[PDB]
């Protein structure tokens, strides 16, 4: 059974146990005269509870029932200190429900009886999951902040709600307010929750408090892509120096944005976030002015020096493939089997030569330039986690599949050499088409080339390989039918389909109109051919090819804002990649320091504005 | 004569007979002094009636004439009990007209004289037809509900209007309110017509009353696509269990939506509806949450198990086509007629062999896997009606034309075998291109492949075969003209047009630039060729091919909301198809039952909401 069906059994078995007992019946129905009578003559022992394990008070708080609840607490005093007991509702007190329904008079009535305001609702239906429509945390202060009920919030603070409290994820009440969809009402709640944090310096204050995955709520607003709360959290960390007319020289703090950190860099988490909304933090005014300084001053020359060291690396690898030790075919084995074209095989003659030692010091460049690649990718596998790292298409993406499989095939050819293995062309041909299609990684400068190579990377994953599947259906229907009409025939005349692997290959080529129509006019092709070929030509190159241009040319102007927004986020991911790797003998820390211009020890960035 | 012109003769001959008699003249003109005089001295016998057969009262009610009507009823008492008599206006009383014009004081004056409120207007102009701008039913209560006149409605109820009455289609007054274009004013009328239905249990109440085609008005609102009345009819059949903050766990009844029925399944009628608006019932909140549970829990694994049994079926059919009994050409008949390519013919050697018995148990799979297909399509022909079933493109569509013509051609080849008929390639080549283009049916999972194969199915019916017709015009103009310039010439040099069926085929190929331009440079082609070929190349592959991409690439982004909405409705039609076919040892009934969680015997679906 699914967990979705398992909780539907629970949320309906609760409704059976309400109807079975007349106490929980009248609790949700607010029958005052029944409760004044049912609690006199041997008032029932309240171990009789619901199916989840809740009292009559959790039922009478699940519905807006003040008078039904106060008559429960006067007769039975010990109900507000009682949690629900089922496994997806652990610890949900009556206070956790009265807060959610914004029932003002009930929370006053629960807290005056001494309800625990620090009870954790550790149920499996309260945790953050894609099949839970809310994530409001565990504590009732975290429930009050997320329903936007500011009167319940400060009512809890007056009775001892701890704003520094963390739930099973470690999310404080500020982490949870960022995760809410109602973004514009969480900035007003964030201002309210700081003014009751007069207490200071216990653990880096209320805001810089980390998660269990290390995310401070400033750093979480970048991962989540909460640009509304991001600008709110920046108001504390900017200084307006002067206003000379329409100009405004504001001075951002750039301490929690910039890494001087070890591995929890803020800009690493934004660009590598799975959330789609996170690519808008990279356009916010202390960040956009920062990563445009890192890129243009340092990142763009260091990426173009390093792009031409890789073009010179591949142009050194082809010439050591072109020049390769091929002898002269020392056999008469081509005299049998006249269908064989082949000539010279391979050599173990890197030594007895003059111009194969020029080649040898160009093969040692490619061997010790593809072990360099493996020493720059494999320690970057284990940092991200090997599954996120190959699928981002911002954070490198499927150019690390290519650059590892390139450099693997250069090292296979090294083992194809030195052991005199024959089929050395087979990793050389794959390394050449992958080593050059890895030069296309370095279009991540180059606004000219930038968004165009994302569209290649996007039309190859969505739009080509949904056309590819219904190519294979068509070029197996016809390829297997062209093989049947010419199985009868003589393959010296029109031998395009002489074999079943070649009938698949000739029809795939015919599907793209590269190979011409198989036609010999000095002989009589079978009449079944021109019927199948009339049908093929209409399906293949009227319909299926030109509809592919429509799929291609329609889903292209859809992704026009989105292929260009994804390139601006791909330049940021390139800069952040680069500043990890190349040492600091290179990039001095961004922004102007603060102990020379003595006000602090922080590293500020100056931005001047213009009031339109 | 058309019926449109025949009723225009009627609606104008009525206007002649008004002008001829001075009584019906002054009835529509409201001349009070004439009617007080024309009814004294031998008041005219009112068998004198109009051309339709109406009295002066139906004329004086067709126009808003109170005082002209009351002077008719005082002098002639017996006029309100008199119907119109022409064949497209049968039974239309004066009450059927005064109700339509919302004439409040006239309906009070007719009913006080004892007008029949249960008269059926059985005219041929009142029936539901595409050339009738209204369908308001037969009874005057059905006329009052459709003009939105709530005061006339309850005035009829006080005098004995039967809300359970049915017209010649069997439509009750609730069936007719769903068929109205004025949808938002029929929900207010539907609330009014239930409160005068206090009487209960005569025939499953007012709402569940069936049509003559079996449609209850709940089930009719799904066929018609009346999503406004669909949500109104669902308010009676949902239970709101609890509201935990923004959550709402409502509990839908799922009795009239789900089939536990025989053949009148609600979701069958929605997806197979000819109405375009019906595909929006599949996005309404008790239905969208239901068919997404049936598909993802049961429907999607059962459709992917059954899609790979069909890929293994076709990949078993090609290998028994590739391997097929071809001998060695035992004749020297290729020594005459050197234009013949052919070699080996056919064999009756499934027996004397070792590796044709492996083929034989793979041909018996294809024979007894294409009689299975005929036993799963032919009893599904007669249920829908053989003409709707092949044209829906949601309800299978033209993948049942293909899967029947596939399985017919496998059984032809079985008769081409066992009788030693020669041309066995001719049904084998057609079965291969149809058996594989039937694998493309199973893209009805697979959101990747789903909407793309509808666009193939849509650009082949609208956009290709309107380009195909004006291909055939062009590739007959030029093919017949390329044949004429080369009829003179010698076919050993440039024999692309050596015959008139090959000139059509070479020009069709030239139209698609598959075959190259026919050009021999060692001989002088006729000068008339390069003039016709310059014209062809401009019309064929500048204009007509690239304008086809424009037709293809323009009508593609038009159908983008509509190819994707039509795939969500095609997954629902797949689920509903599947739950008929595969037995219930498989799909337990959807939704949670009701006698274990004892409140009824109905099968509820729980949906929880989130108030934004």
Swiss-Prot record, chains A, B:
Detected in kidney cortex, in distal convoluted tubules and cortical collecting ducts (at protein level). Detected in duodenum, jejunum, ileum, kidney and placenta. Changing residue 516 to A: Abolishes Ca(2+) permeation and Ca(2+)-dependent current decay; no effect on monovalent cations permeation. GO terms for molecular function: calcium channel activity; calmodulin binding; identical protein binding; metal ion binding. Activated by WNK3. Keywords: ANK repeat, Calcium, Calcium channel, Calcium transport, Calmodulin-binding, Cell membrane, Glycoprotein, Ion channel, Ion transport, Membrane, Metal-binding, Phosphoprotein, Repeat, Transmembrane, Transmembrane helix, Transport. It is a multi-pass membrane protein. One of its GO terms (biological process) is calcium ion import across plasma membrane. The chain crosses the membrane at residues 302-322, 360-382, 394-416, 423-443, 467-487, 531-551. The keyword Transferase does not apply. It catalyses: Ca(2+)(in) = Ca(2+)(out). Glycosylated. Residues 1-301, 383-393, 444-466 are cytoplasmic. Residues 498-518 dip into the membrane without crossing it. ANK repeats lie at residues 18-48, 52-81, 90-119, 136-165, 169-202, 213-242. It is found in: Cell membrane; Apical cell membrane. GO terms for cellular component: apical plasma membrane; plasma membrane. It comes from the Eukaryota. Ca(2+) binds at residue 516. Constitutively active calcium selective cation channel thought to be involved in Ca(2+) reabsorption in kidney and intestine. Required for normal Ca(2+) reabsorption in the kidney distal convoluted tubules. The channel is activated by low internal calcium level and the current exhibits an inward rectification. A Ca(2+)-dependent feedback regulation includes fast channel inactivation and slow current decay. Heteromeric assembly with TRPV6 seems to modify channel properties. TRPV5-TRPV6 heteromultimeric concatemers exhibit voltage-dependent gating. Belongs to the transient receptor (TC 1.A.4) family. TrpV subfamily. TRPV5 sub-subfamily. Homotetramer. Probably forms heterotetramers with TRPV6. Interacts with TRPV6. Interacts with S100A10 and probably with the ANAX2-S100A10 heterotetramer. The interaction with S100A10 is required for the trafficking to the plasma membrane. Interacts with calmodulin. Interacts with BSPRY, which results in its inactivation. This is Transient receptor potential cation channel subfamily V member 5. It comes from Oryctolagus cuniculus (Rabbit).
